[PDB]
Design an enzyme around this catalytic site. Sequence first.
Site, PDB file in Angstrom:
ATOM      1  N   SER B 250     -54.498  23.991   1.683  1.00 18.68           N
ATOM      2  CA  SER B 250     -54.091  24.230   0.308  1.00 18.68           C
ATOM      3  C   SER B 250     -52.987  23.339  -0.245  1.00 18.68           C
ATOM      4  O   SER B 250     -52.198  22.739   0.497  1.00 18.68           O
ATOM      5  CB  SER B 250     -53.650  25.685   0.157  1.00 18.68           C
ATOM      6  OG  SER B 250     -54.577  26.565   0.755  1.00 18.68           O
ATOM      7  N   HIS B 335     -53.272  33.237  -1.278  1.00 14.53           N
ATOM      8  CA  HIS B 335     -53.518  33.270   0.157  1.00 14.53           C
ATOM      9  C   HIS B 335     -52.637  34.230   0.947  1.00 14.53           C
ATOM     10  O   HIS B 335     -53.110  34.837   1.906  1.00 14.53           O
ATOM     11  CB  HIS B 335     -53.431  31.858   0.737  1.00 14.53           C
ATOM     12  CG  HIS B 335     -54.538  30.965   0.284  1.00 14.53           C
ATOM     13  ND1 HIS B 335     -55.857  31.194   0.608  1.00 14.53           N
ATOM     14  CD2 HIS B 335     -54.529  29.858  -0.497  1.00 14.53           C
ATOM     15  CE1 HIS B 335     -56.615  30.267   0.045  1.00 14.53           C
ATOM     16  NE2 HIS B 335     -55.834  29.445  -0.633  1.00 14.53           N
TER      17      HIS B 335
END
Lengths: 392, 395
Positions: B250, B335
């Site tokens: 990410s 997340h």
Amino acid sequence: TRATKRQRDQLRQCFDARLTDVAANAAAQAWQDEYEAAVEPLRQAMLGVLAEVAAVRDATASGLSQALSNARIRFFKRFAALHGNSACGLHFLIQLRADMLRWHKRIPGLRELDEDLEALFSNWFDVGLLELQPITWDSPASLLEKLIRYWTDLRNRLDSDRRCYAFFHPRIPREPLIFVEVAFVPEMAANVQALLDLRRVKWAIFYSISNTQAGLRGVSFGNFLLKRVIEELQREHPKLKQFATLSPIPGFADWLRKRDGESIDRVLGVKRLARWREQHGEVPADGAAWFSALSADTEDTVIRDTAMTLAAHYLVREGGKGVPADPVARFHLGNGACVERVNWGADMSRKGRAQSCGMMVNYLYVPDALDDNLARLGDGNPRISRAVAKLL
Amino acid sequence: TRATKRQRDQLRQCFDARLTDVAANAAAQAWQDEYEAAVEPLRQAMLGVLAEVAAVRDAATASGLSQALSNARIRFFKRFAALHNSACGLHFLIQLRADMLRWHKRIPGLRELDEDLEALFSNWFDVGLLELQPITWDSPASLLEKLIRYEISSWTDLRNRLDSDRRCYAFFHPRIPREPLIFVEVAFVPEMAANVQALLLRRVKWAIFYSISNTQAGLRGVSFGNFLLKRVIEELQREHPKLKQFATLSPIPGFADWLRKRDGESIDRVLGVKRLARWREQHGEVPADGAAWFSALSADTEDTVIRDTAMTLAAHYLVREGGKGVPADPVARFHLGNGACVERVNWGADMSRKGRAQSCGMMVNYLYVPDALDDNLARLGDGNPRISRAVAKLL
Ligand SMILES: [Mg+2]
């Protein structure tokens, strides 16, 4: 990295070379053309190259920040000096900031370039350097169509009992920078729907002042903006002595709903809180609830007074010292005006009720006081009339 | 007012009448049509009527007004989500919020309607109510063109992402097929990825999520639950029972904007005396503030002291910055809010123009351990994000 290396090289010269360097200026002239003749995505990409070049140097830490600041500034100064399809280098720079501004979320790394240019634009387009021009129904249609974007409505606003102007940069005619709308009426206006709808008129009121350039959003034009317009109004009509605005208070609702109950109790005071319980019972739990309670009846006198006190407080006592939280209050207060009066049921449009419960404000401009007020605002003590002090 | 009074009446029913009232539902059905077949300005105007109606009550204490106003707005959306141009009432509502969202600055008074709907949308589109579907190069072009809009413009990019060594899915609401809600892109590689430019079956052991995107403008800001990736991993394990390693590669989008808002004092506190000393020794002057820090950390992607300093600042940003149990970083919030563990910070992970501008090219890996997602989800509410040894060491 095909031709994107040619633009990088170009930009390096524009950033690093001296302002006089004929080659670097040629490069700038080149980059401009290539930018003006490019699809939307191509420009967004060229902006990515620009923020790439602006972030680095081609050696202390303090010396890096300064060198980076000095190159970005040098980059814009070079473009503002080129005298294409746009009026000139300065003009191009205006459109360039238009893109930087709308694409900020897409193209990261332009924040510093945007901040620097905005600051340069404040010196270059300061009112003292702009020319004032009257706008009438006789003006070129091609010009009049730049005020609509930022026709019978234009007509009435451009009529005998009305006076409109526009500030232009001397080297960018055709492109209005600021649009001022003025109305002549017998009494200092208290309801905007009246204006937007010369025998014995004594009041000159500014009911609209708008920035007509996207690339200039956020730029400061100085504190003599309206002072300059009044001079033009007095030259035109030496008999005019009364000057005021009928302005909106756009950020009132959004501010109110962010306050808790405690803060509003402190604003209203014990007596006002008591007058409220007596007439309406329960005190709204918080700001959000206050907004809903103050919009429920435009006729109630207690609601009116409570809302007016909250409004006067908002625009006079809210802000980071010498800087009114309200943008509209900041502009006019930052031009030497005095918060003269709060008007209930001044703007009953859908938008008016949604922004401030239909409340508008009058900022009074007294020629021989603009300086004194401009000073008192820096002390964090905005000039106020008796009627407004009474609401506090 | 020639007809704006008809819409007001319509909306009054939709807001005030009971959900069952056949007439009010007819009214809603009517208002929808009139809205779907209208020029941009006409809709912006109809939205002005809606915020007008939503702010008041027809023909009560102050606490009772707020509640009555809340209950009517909610009732208004519930009625529309129940009807069956767009896929249905629920679908329309998605486009309606799309407009409310882009016109907020133009049409004031929609803030409350937007907030309420966003909240309803979180219950209605919770992952537990969505169906998961595999997306391949064989999927309908008309569907595939909804993922490009929300990744080069060349469908060839879609191709590689939709290839053998890749796996992509989309969550759809059962009553709105054709309209993907969320797009998940997964890559299979031998090692937990450390450089995004790389990702873009024989002996692969790593499943990595390199992209998760919301493909509906009207759903921007809506929460889909904490079992979003958990659900995708179950699908990946069903498909390949041999897969046990799950992580993401990410970005950390809000790193630069956060750093340049910090003064010198705050960064000294983050780095610590030893790190500050290692910096003076190698680079001399300490950047005066956050902004100066960003410029110093972008000046040399090779220097070891810059790398370490930046990595410590990054780990701090995503692990210790946020309003308690809510990571300041949006990507870290998603997340972390799915049971993941901040597993490692990667230097030179995304050397694109954008990567260097957002976080000096730094990316992060969030590790998903099936039998831990719950525990981590709990620890995050305590304001103590799950972290690996390597990341604790950076802190
Ligand atoms: Mg320091």
